[PDB]
Design a protein around this ligand. Structure first.
Ligand code: CLA
Ligand code: CLA
Ligand code: CLA
Ligand code: CLA
Ligand code: CLA
Ligand SMILES: CC(C)=CCC/C(C)=C/CC/C(C)=C/CC/C(C)=C/CC/C(C)=C/CC/C(C)=C/CC/C(C)=C/CC/C(C)=C/CC/C(C)=C/CC1=CC(=O)C(C)=C(C)C1=O
Ligand SMILES: CCCCCCCCCCCCCCCCCC(=O)OC[C@H](CO[C@@H]1O[C@H](CO)[C@H](O)[C@H](O)[C@H]1O)OC(=O)CCCCCCCCCCCCCCCCC
Ligand SMILES: CCCCCCCCCCCCCCCC(=O)OC[C@H](COP(=O)(O)OC[C@@H](O)CO)OC(=O)CCCCCCCCCCCCCCC
Ligand SMILES: CCCCCCCCCCCCCCCC(=O)OC[C@H](COP(=O)(O)OC[C@@H](O)CO)OC(=O)CCCCCCCCCCCCCCC
Ligand SMILES: CC1=C(/C=C/C(C)=C/C=C/C(C)=C/C=C/C=C(C)/C=C/C=C(C)/C=C/C2=C(C)CCCC2(C)C)C(C)(C)CCC1
Ligand SMILES: CC1=C(/C=C/C(C)=C/C=C/C(C)=C/C=C/C=C(C)/C=C/C=C(C)/C=C/C2=C(C)CCCC2(C)C)C(C)(C)CCC1
Ligand code: OEX
Ligand SMILES: [Cl-]
Ligand SMILES: [Cl-]
Ligand SMILES: [Fe+3]
Lengths: 34, 34, 29, 37, 32, 340, 33, 82, 63, 172, 505, 36
């Protein structure tokens, strides 16, 4: 029913966000050397 | 402690919502197997 | 005597190369 | 004497026996339900 | 250099014995 | 019989095959993987090593680890119900109980997997050379994660399950064991690098000696699994390497056997060397050169240079790498070159 | 097609905890000393 | 290859009933994980020291386990002096 | 083949090749001893490992 | 240097100055050579296992293959059947051309990166530095495995070429 | 023809020549035992068990003869130090002679069973095919093993009819061959208890006899026979190899960790005794007790046996050797001659300082002196420009109590430094480095070499288990798989059960 | 009577070259440690 290319793009978009959040947390809070 | 119920609460609701959405399809599979 | 031993082995290996290439077992179809 | 060390050993024995027990009890049960035609 | 006096003989046998074993096996194969 | 009934179910053709080996493999492997993911996310190493090692503490993927138990634990199994943890899960983690948890369940996991290889190969009808080859990773795991710390003082000096922790293990073996100078690691290096060479050169050769079995520029479509003909020219591939390199493969079966032999033999050789290091039986020195260098202060090789580096590594990392030793090195005793 | 199979369990044993763990680490990015 | 018999992953993740169920279950597990950290339950379960729970106000001495069998109480006496 | 005086005496000891017991036979009984031997090894292992500490059993050079 | 020990000297000094271990390109190189050796052992075992019987027990199996024969010496169908059940079928290759390409791609690409690793670290773009990255509430440095790696790197640094340095910073 | 690595496979269906080949291996092993014993006897110095024992002279088979009773020589000396004793025939020389004569007889026997391979006994009565009833063979040989196992523990070990075994004090100072009574309590599983070893071979001996009789009278189940391939002799090789590395891993463990079967007077001390300062605690205990009895400091240390102080020395630590540092330990630091006595370092304040000892992991180690609390007070500086804890600045001296330097005190800093560098090795000893041309580089003991050898062989035999194990189970396809294997069999979904032709959907 | 289990042994030229290479290289590697 739902196009597979849409599911892949959304899931992919979700990956980049949650990965980007981790790289964001590398410069802020714990483990940021600050 | 109260923190356990807070953390497990979304898990319980998630499992519950999934059951009622699959229950009519789930028990039929056991009808057919038995 | 250590040197002579090291060189001798190296020499044998180079010699082995020559025989494994020019005097190999010819592959046939 | 039953030393605290020995007490734990029997706990480890029973725990392992239950795990292996329940495992095979489930697998054998499922095997009897969905047999191969 | 003050090296082991058995280094020479141990190295010589380590080469000679198994290589001889191979040579022997080869020559008796081509003769077959 | 119930045995035969269960055998049928276990050997059912599924998306994920189970088998009798699955009863041992799947739970142990799941606990080993899960135990590592759990420890590197929450569990610390503050009481065992004096180190942070979880995402919760601020560590990243490269620095997180499940660290080895404290040296005072010795070679204890560190069971949860053991006399050290005494049933307390929290204390169990703080003592390093998760390391043995992963190491041990991981060991029986590897056993289950190798058995799985035997089992499937027997059902399919092929030779078990895949299981045989898998003996090399096992020999490595056993020698390094089990035998080596058993030979030493405790589990503490085993590798910690982590990226940077492994890098510690690498440099430790250089400074203390001079592991690079050991011939058994050298044969391992030749096996790994030689394996990668064989892997690259075989795939490249085959891909560049392909027959034309299609009209498309992308030749991947020009193959069918049920075809009886070779997809590449062994004859052409033989002549090429014969003129380029001097020698070449002429037998496909010997080729793929050799591809098994090289990396498997290498790992087994490196495994033997680790067994030696467990007893501090190292290829650390050449006596002939030490005698010369001690008598002649003008004699220098790359070998004597590396030993100076090992001496530096040891004296500078030991107090923090071995906090149980309570090493206190005054600055004046530290081995240092000029300026630096 | 069967709904609950061996594959089903094999999935959720890795699936369920992963998302739970990802959410946990996501919250850790906002922890300040 | 053929197919073993289970339902193809492709059609399931493209089915509506799936995303009806998993638009609730997946975020709930995510939130559950979030709550496991934000409440601070993770710290007490695994015994992982909080940023203010590594040292006391004037110590750099590492609370290192030195005993084998009395190691549990040795860790507990470390938690006490905080 | 060759007959010998020692061969004739030993003959019955090598005369039941391939002979087996029907079905599972004493397999379950074997498993019981296999279970007890596993427990046994597990005991002496943890004794040496000091995971199992018993009264009167001091695992040390001191004894 | 053109030597065995000299090679090791090159590796040790390199780590102390570039932290090559904590560099994602050497790590791809390690993944390239470990994976290469793995896949080499893997491909070798699966093909050998699926060899069609052409010989007896009193002779080598290699004599079941003749140089330049039309027929393939093994059964990829059986081999794929095995490895496809060892994991799951869609994690296995049924295409010999696609399989062999992967055999070439993986270690080559991996070595390409570790090559570029040395090449980029040549201009002093060094590996990840997480020294004193973790800090507690008060300000105390909470060491990680990275800080332990650092202590090891300090040992090589202060000792390498013990007479060649006259100034506190190692630049050349 | 046969590949080089398959030449010995011609014995698989040839019981007669398999026995002959097995006879020849037995002859070679027994021949090695005799040759090794004779070699060691020709190179062993028995003039001192204290500072130059067997495990310092690289003796390997000698401690094994000593462990089970053989302690005397025809020349008159005994390893215990006694003279004027009569071992009879069963001396070190007598034992070697026995294994050499045995080697020759087994050799001749191998020639016979090789020529006369076609014996009727190896033939199956009905088929006429060469056959071996492996299940009953196991029962017979297991019955024999149990009897010998029982007899060994019951007579030889107990001293009922035999010498007994080597036993000693917890610090290995007064070791000898003594009869041992069986330990039947739970303490019999404490491996530092000699009585456990006796009780083991008696109890397991009985079990072997019972099991032997069982495995003789009761035929194998139909399923186990087919599952384990009990008609194929290679299934025995696989399982035997399996049990062999299991035993090989065990003897390696008990050697490295130490047990009642691995006495420190025969194989040397362990690394864990150095780690825990096992000998230093006992030495201090005796000193403190002597001082408390009224003895002076010179008298307290002089009462310390040098055999005990020698154990408290890192040169005897089996974890200090190298893989290619060959020879005895005397080739390293030299032949131990004399204990120089205990070194006591003090600064200019008279406060006693303690030299930090060297861990086994460290090839080299700095000299650092601390007080009784663990606070650094003196060291030997690398960089001198900013030195603060130097011996010259802190006025460090050294006094020896006991040994041959007893009552002497040195003030000269380079001399004090010299003894300090030796103090990181534990107790200081005078060595003879000229007799064997020692190089001053530590070498491991026979305890280490045994551990390494059998641990490597065990790991290697694990592959032997797998290989020969695979060969047994896939015997039908090791020359290649079925020429036209049905694709349907290996393709998914076709069968309900993998491989079972009778399960098509 | 002759033994029917006897078999001829072979070692082709390629195996010889490979084998000699294995030995010569192992020698070149371990020789330094023998001399020490
Ligand atoms: C294939 C399954 C499997 C296997 C092989 C192992 C193996 C292991 N686990 Mg793991 N484990 C498993 C599944 C498994 N586990 C599962 C499913 C879980 C989750 C529930 C766990 C949870 C777990 C924990 C929490 C721990 C282990 C640990 C261990 C280790 C110690 C086990 C032990 O001492 O058992 C002893 C028990 C047996 C060997 C069973 C004996 C059975 C026979 C038939 C005897 C029967 C006796 C009879 C019933 C009488 C009972 C006593 C009576 C007289 C009173 C070992 C490496 C420990 C570890 O790693 O510590 C570092 C540890 O703490 N496991
Ligand atoms: C040219 C560089 C080079 C190369 C090619 C090698 C090659 C090798 N080294 Mg050496 N080494 C080098 C340089 C090099 N080294 C240097 C300069 C040093 C510094 C002195 C070291 C220090 C060093 C050490 C300290 C060790 C090695 C070891 C090894 C071997 C590792 C084998 C392996 O893959 O184990 C990998 C491990 C296994 C195969 C075990 C099984 C692993 C299982 C299958 C994992 C399953 C995971 C599962 C799927 C789930 C994972 C999930 C997770 C990823 C999320 C190999 C022979 C090791 C060795 O000799 O071991 C015997 C070892 O301990 N090296
Ligand atoms: C387990 C540990 C491990 C592993 C697996 C690796 C793996 C690797 N390391 Mg790393 N490394 C490690 C630990 C490890 N390292 C540690 C602990 C340190 C710190 C001490 C380092 C420091 C380090 C450095 C400094 C370097 C590596 C490099 C490498 C790579 C070596 C292989 C290579 O370059 O092939 C590539 C192949 C070649 C170089 C061979 C070329 C051959 C030419 C073309 C022909 C030669 C012909 C010959 C002369 C004659 C033949 C004769 C014949 C025909 C008869 C590889 C990615 C190297 C790298 O990445 O290089 C790019 C590198 O420079 N490592
Ligand atoms: C179980 C085996 C074993 C053990 C543990 C010992 C232990 C000992 N022996 Mg004894 N010895 C043994 C067997 C053993 N020996 C045998 C079988 C013989 C008959 C030849 C001898 C003959 C002998 C003599 C003549 C002497 C000793 C001595 C010694 C002592 C010193 C050993 C030493 O320095 O080794 C050094 C260890 C090594 C050099 C390690 C070798 C590693 C090999 C070469 C690796 C091979 C790698 C392989 C080729 C590569 C494979 C590649 C792959 C692709 C296949 C020590 C007490 C000495 C002593 O002190 O006597 C009083 C002495 O003089 N032994
Ligand atoms: C009790 C031990 C034992 C026994 C009786 C056998 C018996 C057999 N093995 Mg097995 N094997 C064993 C242990 C054993 N193996 C172990 C532990 C391993 C792992 C290392 C292997 C690995 C192995 C392989 C890979 C193969 C066999 C094969 C065979 C068969 C032919 C062997 C042959 O012709 O060699 C002939 C050997 C030579 C002509 C020369 C070998 C020289 C070696 C490599 C070095 C020198 C060793 C030295 C002389 C002795 C040192 C002994 C000491 C270390 C204990 C035969 C049935 C073969 C088979 O299945 O054939 C169908 C086969 O391919 N075995
Ligand atoms: C003057 C002096 C003294 C100089 C000496 C200086 C010096 C440094 C000397 C040292 C020399 C030296 C080599 C030291 C190393 C010692 C060392 C590491 C020894 C280890 C030996 C050993 C036991 C290792 C155990 C592990 C092991 C067996 C590894 C094997 C490695 C190995 C043989 C790799 C070979 C890789 C290789 C060359 C592959 C190419 C083969 C080839 C041409 C295939 C062509 C080809 C491909 C196809 O795909 C197809 C289809 C066809 C048809 C075809 O043809
Ligand atoms: C029959 C012929 C067949 C061929 C035989 C060829 C033999 C060649 C042997 C080459 C290597 C020999 C050792 C070289 C080093 C040396 O010189 O030792 C020299 C040593 C003797 O050492 C000498 O001792 C003297 C005092 O007696 C002095 O101290 C001398 O200075 C000292 O050199 O020889 C031995 O120790 C032999 C015994 C070694 C026992 C090792 C057991 C563990 C081995 C494990 C190996 C596992 C490998 C697995 C691989 C897979
Ligand atoms: C398009 C991206 C290319 C990336 C660089 C090339 C990598 C692959 C080639 C390696 C060469 C090996 C030696 C020759 C091996 C050889 O001879 O190959 C042969 C193989 C056969 O292709 P054909 O000859 O049928 O087609 C070639 C052309 O005619 C196009 O049809 O070529 C390819 O498959 C090309 C694939 C392109 C796509 C590859 C992408 C792979 C990289 C993706 C990114 C990975 C990043 C990893 C980061 C960790
Ligand atoms: C990164 C790793 C990549 C691997 C290969 C990826 C294939 C990439 C590929 O081409 O896949 C393509 C394939 C597409 O399948 P379809 O949607 O056509 O449906 C076919 C299947 O659903 C079977 O009916 O996707 C999958 O099969 C994903 C399966 C995940 C199943 C996860 C289950 C895990 C179970 C536990 C692990 C078992 C291990 C057993 C030994 C221990
Ligand atoms: C310990 C223990 C246990 C166990 C538990 C478990 C088993 C758990 C598990 C857990 C888990 C199971 C978890 C998981 C997790 C996962 C995760 C966390 C993931 C992540 C991922 C990621 C992060 C990704 C990344 C990436 C990649 C890799 C690709 C490329 C790109 C990216 C970046 C995206 C029990 C209770 C039994 C008992 C007690 C003890
Ligand atoms: C005939 C006769 C006789 C005589 C006998 C004899 C005289 C014998 C001898 C015998 C002998 C005299 C034997 C010997 C043997 C020896 C051996 C068998 C050895 C071996 C060795 C080895 C095998 C080694 C190896 C190795 C190496 C080489 C190196 C290191 C490592 C190893 C250890 C591996 C008489 C008159 C009495 C009587 C009867 C008849
Ligand atoms: O020269 Mn050869 O290594 Ca390049 O960094 Mn600066 O310079 Mn020397 O120090 Mn570090
Ligand atoms: Cl340098
Ligand atoms: Cl400068
Ligand atoms: Fe291929």
């Amino acid at each position: 029913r739902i196009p597979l290319w849409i599911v892949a793009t959304v899931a992919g978009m979700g990956v980049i966000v949650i990965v980007g959040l981790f790289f964001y947390g590398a410069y802020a809070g714990l483990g940021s050397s600050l | 402690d109260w923190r356990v119920l807070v953390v497990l609460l979304p898990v319980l609701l998630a499992a519950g919502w999934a059951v009622r959405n699959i229950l009519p399809y789930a028990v039929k599979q056991v009808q057919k197997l038995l | 005597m250590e040197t002579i031993t090291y060189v001798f082995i190296f020499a044998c290996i180079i010699a082995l190369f020559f025989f494994a290439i020019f005097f190999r077992e010819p592959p046939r179809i | 004497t039953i030393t605290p060390s020995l007490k734990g050993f029997f706990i480890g024995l029973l725990s392992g026996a239950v795990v292996l027990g329940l495992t095979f009890a489930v697998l054998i049960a499922i095997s009897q339900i969905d047999k191969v035609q | 250099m003050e090296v082991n006096q058995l280094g020479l003989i141990a190295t010589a046998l380590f080469v000679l014995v198994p290589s001889v074993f191979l040579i022997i096996l080869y020559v008796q194969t081509e003769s077959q | 019989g119930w045995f035969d009934i269960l055998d049928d179910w276990l050997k059912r053709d599924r998306f994920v095959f189970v088998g009798w080996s699955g009863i041992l493999l799947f739970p142990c492997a799941y606990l080993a993987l899960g135990g590592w993911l759990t420890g590197t996310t929450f569990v610390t190493s503050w009481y065992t090593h004096g180190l942070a090692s979880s995402y919760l503490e601020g560590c990243n993927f490269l620095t997180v680890a499940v660290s080895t138990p404290a040296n005072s634990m010795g070679h204890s199994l560190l069971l949860l119900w053991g006399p050290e943890a005494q049933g307390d899960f929290t204390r169990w983690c703080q003592l390093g109980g998760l390391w043995t948890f992963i190491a041990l369940h991981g060991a029986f996991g590897l056993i289950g997997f190798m058995l799985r290889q035997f089992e499937i190969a027997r059902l399919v009808g092929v030779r078990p050379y895949n299981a045989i080859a898998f003996s090399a990773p096992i020999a490595v795991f056993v020698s390094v994660f089990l035998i080596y710390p058993l030979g030493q003082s405790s589990w503490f000096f085993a590798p910690s399950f982590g990226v940077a922790a492994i890098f510690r293990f690498l440099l430790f073996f250089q400074g203390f064991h001079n592991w690079t100078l050991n011939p058994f690691h050298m044969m391992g290096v030749a096996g790994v690098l030689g394996g990668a060479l064989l892997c690259a050169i075989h795939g490249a050769t085959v891909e560049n000696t392909l027959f034309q079995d299609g009209e498309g520029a992308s030749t991947f479509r020009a193959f069918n699994p049920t075809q009886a003909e070779e997809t590449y020219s062994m004859v052409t591939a033989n002549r090429f390497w014969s003129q380029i390199f001097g020698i070449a493969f002429s037998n496909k079966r010997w080729l793929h056997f050799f591809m098994l032999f090289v990396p498997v033999t290498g790992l087994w050789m490196s495994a033997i060397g680790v067994v030696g290091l467990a007893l501090n039986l190292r290829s650390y020195d050449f006596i002939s050169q030490e005698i010369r260098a001690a008598e002649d202060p003008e004699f220098e090789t790359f070998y004597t240079k590396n030993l100076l580096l090992n001496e530096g590594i040891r004296a500078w990392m030991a107090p923090q790498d071995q906090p149980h030793e309570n090493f206190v090195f005054p600055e004046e005793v530290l081995p240092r070159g000029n300026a630096l | 097609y069967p709904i609950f199979t061996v594959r089903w369990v094999a999935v959720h044993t890795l699936a369920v905890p992963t998302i739970f763990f990802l959410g946990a680490i996501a919250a850790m990015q906002f922890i300040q000393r | 290859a053929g197919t073993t018999g289970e339902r193809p992953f492709s059609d399931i993740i493209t089915s509506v009933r799936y995303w009806v169920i998993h638009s609730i279950t997946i975020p709930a597990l995510f939130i559950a994980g979030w709550l496991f950290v934000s409440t601070g339950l993770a710290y007490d379960v695994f015994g992982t020291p909080r940023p203010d729970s590594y040292y006391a106000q004037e110590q750099r001495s590492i609370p290192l386990v030195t005993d084998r069998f009395e190691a549990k109480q040795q860790v507990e006496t470390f938690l006490e002096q905080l | 083949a060759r007959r010998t005086w020692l061969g004739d005496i030993l003959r019955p000891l090598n005369s039941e090749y391939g002979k087996v017991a029907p079905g599972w036979g004493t397999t379950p009984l074997m498993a019981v001893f296999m279970g007890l031997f596993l427990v046994f090894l597990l005991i002496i292992l943890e004794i040496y490992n000091s995971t199992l500490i018993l009264d009167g059993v001091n695992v040390s050079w001191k004894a | 240097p053109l030597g065995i020990s000299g090679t090791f000297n090159f590796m040790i000094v390199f780590q102390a100055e570039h932290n090559i271990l904590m560099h994602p390109f050497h790590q791809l190189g390690v993944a390239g050579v470990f994976g290469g050796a793995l896949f080499c052992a893997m491909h070798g075992s699966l093909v050998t296992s699926s060899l069609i019987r052409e010989t007896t027990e009193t002779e080598s199996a290699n004599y079941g293959y003749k140089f330049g024969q039309e027929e393939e010496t093994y059964n990829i169908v059986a081999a794929h059947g095995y490895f496809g059940r060892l994991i799951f079928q869609y994690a296995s290759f049924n295409n010999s051309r696609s399989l062999h390409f992967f055999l070439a791609a993986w270690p080559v690409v991996g070595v390409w990166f570790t090559a570029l690793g040395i090449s980029t670290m040549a201009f002093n773009l060094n590996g990840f530095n997480f020294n004193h990255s973790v800090i507690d509430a008060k300000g105390n440095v909470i060491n990680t495995w990275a800080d332990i790696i650092n202590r090891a790197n300090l040992g090589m640094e202060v000792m390498h070429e013990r007479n060649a340095h006259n100034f506190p910073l190692d630049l050349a | 023809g046969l590949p080089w690595y398959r030449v010995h496979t011609v014995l698989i269906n040839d019981p007669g020549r398999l026995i002959a080949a097995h006879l020849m291996h037995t002859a070679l092993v027994a021949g090695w035992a005799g040759s090794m014993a004779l070699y060691e006897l020709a190179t062993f110095d028995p003039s001192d068990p204290v500072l130059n024992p067997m495990w310092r002279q690289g003796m390997f088979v000698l401690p094994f003869m000593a462990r089970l009773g053989v302690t005397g020589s025809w020349s008159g000396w005994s390893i215990t130090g006694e003279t004027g004793i009569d071992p009879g025939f069963w001396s070190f020389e007598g034992v070697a002679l026995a294994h050499i004569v045995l080697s020759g007889l087994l050799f001749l026997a191998a020639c016979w069973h090789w020529v006369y391979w076609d014996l009727e006994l190896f033939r199956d009565p009905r088929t006429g095919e060469p056959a071996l009833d492996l299940p009953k063979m196991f029962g017979i040989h297991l019955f024999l093993a149990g009897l010998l196992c029982f007899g060994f523990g019951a007579f030889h070990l107990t001293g009922l009819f035999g010498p007994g075994m080597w036993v000693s004090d917890p610090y290995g100072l007064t070791g000898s061959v003594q009869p041992v009574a069986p330990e039947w309590g739970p303490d019999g599983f404490n491996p530092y208890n000699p009585g456990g070893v006796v009780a083991h071979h008696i109890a397991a001996g009985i079990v072997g006899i019972i099991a032997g009789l069982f495995h003789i009278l009761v035929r194998p189940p139909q399923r186990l026979y087919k599952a384990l391939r009990m008609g194929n002799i290679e299934t025995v090789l696989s399982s035997s190899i399996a049990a062999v590395f299991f035993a090989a891993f065990v003897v390696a463990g008990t050697m490295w960790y130490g047990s009642a079967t691995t006495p420190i007077e025969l194989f040397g001390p362990t690394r864990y005794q150095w780690d825990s300062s096992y000998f230093q605690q006992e030495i201090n205990r005796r000193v403190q007790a002597s001082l408390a009895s009224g003895a002076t400091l010179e008298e307290a240390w002089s009462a310390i046996p040098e055999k005990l102080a020698f154990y408290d020395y890192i040169g005897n630590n089996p974890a200090k050797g190298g893989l290619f540092r060959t020879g005895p330990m005397n080739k390293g630091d030299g032949i131990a001659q004399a204990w120089k006595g205990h070194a006591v370092f003090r600064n200019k304040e008279g406060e006693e300082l303690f030299v930090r000892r060297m861990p086994a992991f460290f090839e080299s180690f700095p000299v650092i002196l601390t007080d009784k609390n663990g606070v650094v007070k003196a060291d030997i500086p690398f960089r001198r420009a900013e030195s603060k804890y130097s011996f010259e600045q802190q006025g460090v001296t050294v006094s020896f109590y006991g040994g041959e330097l007893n009552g002497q005190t040195f003030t000269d800093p380079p001399t004090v430094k010299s003894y300090a560098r030796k103090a990181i090795f534990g107790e200081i000893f005078e060595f003879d480095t000229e007799t064997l041309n020692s190089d001053g580089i530590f070498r491991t003991s026979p305890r280490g070499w045994f551990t390494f050898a059998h641990a490597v062989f065990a790991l290697l035999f694990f592959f032997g288990h797998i290989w020969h194990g695979a060969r047994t189970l896939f015997r039908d396809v090791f020359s290649g798989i079925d020429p036209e294997l049905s694709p349907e069999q290996v393709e998914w979904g076709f069968y309900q059960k993998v491989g079972d032709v009778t399960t098509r959907r | 009577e002759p033994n029917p289990n006897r078999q001829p042994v072979e070692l082709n030229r390629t195996s010889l070259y490979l084998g000699l290479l294995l030995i010569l290289v192992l020698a070149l590697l371990f020789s330094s440690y023998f001399f020490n």
